Every structure is written in structure tokens, then in C-alpha cells.
Amino acid sequence: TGLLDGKRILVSGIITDSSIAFHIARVAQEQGAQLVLTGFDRLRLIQRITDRLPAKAPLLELDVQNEEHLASLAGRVTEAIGAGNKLDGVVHSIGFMPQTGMGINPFFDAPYADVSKGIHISAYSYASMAKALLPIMNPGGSIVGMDFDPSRAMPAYNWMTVAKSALESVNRFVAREAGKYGVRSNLVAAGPIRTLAMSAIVGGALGEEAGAQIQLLEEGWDQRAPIGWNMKDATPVAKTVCALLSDWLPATTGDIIYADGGAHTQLL
Template sequence: MGLLDGKRLLVTGVITETSIAFSVAKVAQEQGAEVVLTGFGRLSLVERVARRLPKPAPVVELDVTSPEHLEALADRVREHVDGLDGVLHSIGFAPASCLGEGFLDAPFADVATAMEVSAFSFKSLAVATLPLFGESGGSILGMDFDARVAWPAYNWMGVAKAALESTSRYLARELGPRRIRVNLVAAGPVRTMAAKSIPGFVQFEEAWEGRAPLGWDINDATPVAMSCAALMSDWFPATTGEMIHVDGGFHAMGV
């Protein structure tokens, strides 16, 4: 019997097999969940990757900045499952000007894009999927990179993640009466396609070496995926508005 037997999950953010979202979808299926994926842009690539899961998963097109896509999402998901018990938001983007060395130089238009895609979309996705949750509620989970501190090169994406953290708390307040839990997983650095687009990402990799008391493998998203599966199961019935660190303990160390 799996941890997610009978659960119906919507997983966003799968791009390649190295995506954290792919690992979450894989672990979720192994634990008995029925999974639907969303894709944006190169949809054929996502569909190809979806066929590499233990059970090929359907893919629904979703641009989280498109009102039309968001409005149609519930109906598109119902083509594959009759409702949802959990949603994973694993979406983030910042224009090049928002990353690297130019924190003081990024124009507001680019910052606004980073905020809309990386933070506001958490609310947009929650609202779009609400009609799919039943009376028993469920779990909405977001992927985070601890924004309580300033990171080198992360710049305005770090600010957007701070906004995501605040958004999750307000969503937890609003959706609690519907028995929907809203939490974040603050993962350590994992070598994904998105991570490779961050200038200076190697600094994160080097920082984790020797400081995470449990150790940390930047090439293995499985520990993150297992934690996500647990949070979307029934085993955290009274946990909401929380940020769970899955980083080998790095966040708790000084030097």
C-alpha cells in the first residue's frame, strides 16, 4: 500500500528528467498516485519526458500568465481525472537582467515578470484548481529556495521567492476553511535545467559541500521528491503555512 494510494495530483514544472517536478511525479506514482502534468512552450518535449515515468502521464498545456489557460485548466484536467487531491507548483522564471551581478540595474518590467511567474502564479494556480478539490480538501505545495537570506547571483529571483513564501502563508489562511493545506518545500540546490540558467550557480554547490550535516547530492532530487510526496499525503493533516527545509540541514548551520 502506497503513501498516495488513490490520490490525484497535478504536477507542474516538468521540463526534463532532471527537473525536481519529474522526480516528484515519479515518486508519487510509485506511491500509488494518479498524476497529470502541465507543460508550457515545448509541449512535445514534456510529453516525451512524461512517457519516461513509471506510468506515462497525460500533459495539459498551461501558461500560468494566461487568463485563458487558467480559466480552462479545471476542464482540461477533468479530461483525465475526476478531481484533485494535490497540486505541485514548481514554476519559476526571471529574465536575465534579474540574475547575476546587476541587482541595482534590473528594470521593473523584468522584475514584474519574475514576480508574476514565480510568485503570483502560486495564487493563480490555486484559484484555477480550486473547483477540482472536494470537501475533504487536499494539499497545494510549492517549490522554494529559502529566501530568508540574500544569495549571490540569485538577486530578483530571491525577492520573488520571498514573495512566494509570503503568498503561501496568505493562501494557507484563505484555503484552510476548505481543508486545503498550503506549504512550501525549500530544497537544497539540484542540478536542473533551471539551475543551470542561474549565473554563479556553482557557488551554491560549493557552499553545500561540507556544511550540510546530512550531506547533499546536487544530482539527486529524490529526497526532495519524497518529502513532497509526504506533504501531499494524509500524514500532515494539521500542517499548513509552513516551509519545510529539505537541504541536508544546511539552513541550520552557521559556518
């Protein structure tokens, strides 16, 4: 009876209880969705974290840089949700950039191997996951990825900005493919969320100046947002992802929905 009643949804990207994907998973389950989860590398940790979700959900291993994992993924999902069943939704909440590509390390000093790894995980993998899963998605389905608005440059975000610009472009091409299946593809551009790592960066993990810059970004964000922005609360973001996973945005694809308090619409 919830927003997502009866829907089978794959959620990637949980690593801590502060992960945006954890909150996406929690809200989707509150709204009646049946989930399959995917996790990278630390599956014991991730199972222990996801035990706290309101309902049980199978956890599958997925390193998006691993071709074998991607080749087997649809079969492993079908095993978890049962033969003859398909997915209605896929959430990509995956991002990574080596520390040379973010923070106080100069923009020009990031080696391309590092940048390439970040773009692989943060942008190309959105296509990789759609390739793997569209064959087991139902018409009317929905693929959602997470974005951080890269239309303008900003301090420290550096090559991760570039990776997000690439992701936005990938999403428009994934929509062309997904459309053949009756499936939508979209991104949610979220405001800053104080995940574990972000608090670590604010605390200086990538250099003092980067931490200072993020605090400034956060303060400015809430100021600009006409309805404000609470960086400690991922729930408005998770709700937005569930809106796109639902039946209520049926004519939106290849697009970007901004769950950012309206900040990007305001100069000051």
C-alpha cells in the same frame, strides 16, 4: 498501497528529465498516485520527456501568465480525471526570472518589467493556480510549491530571491483560502539541485562570477548540511513533496518544510 495510493495529483513544472517536477512525478507514481501533468509552451518536448515516467499521465497546457489557460484549467483537469472526480494534490514547480534579474547583471540594472514577469510566474502564479484548482480539490488535499530559502541575500540570485520572498508570503495567504476547502498549502525549500539550467549557469551562462558563486554555494551547502547534500539527486526533495501530499502532515499549512540536508540550521 504506496504513500499516495488512490490520490489524484496535478504536477506542474516538468520541462526536462532533470526538472525537480519530473522526479516529484516519478516518486508520486511509484507511491500509487494518479497524475495529471501541466506544461508550458513546449508540449511536444514535455510529452516525450514524460513518456519515461513509470505510468501514463495526461498532459495539459498551462502558461500561468495566460488568463484563458487558467480560466479553462479546472474543466480540462476534470475532463482528464473524469467527471465526479476531484484532485487530492497540486504541485507548483514553476519559476522564472529574466537574465537581467539573476546572474552577474547588477542588481540595480534589472528593469521592473523583467522583475514583474519573474514575480508573476514565480510568486503570483501560486495564487493563480490555487484559485483555479481549489474548486476541484477534495477535503484533506494538499497544495505544494517549491522554494529556495530567501531569508538571507546571496550573490547572483538577486531578484529571484525577492520573488521567493514574495512566494513565501503568498503561500501564507493561500493557506487561508485553501483552509476553507479543508486543503493545506505549503512550500518545500530545497537545497541546490543541479538541473540543466544550473549546470548551464555553473558553466557561465549568466556570467563567470555567477557560476563561481554557485559552485561556492553548492560546496558550502554540503559542508553545512549535517547529513550532507547531493546536488545531483532530487529524490530526497521529491520524497519530501510526497510527504506533504500525503495524509501524514495533516496539521501543517501556510508553512515551509526544508529539504536541504539541514543546511539552513547551521552557520558553518
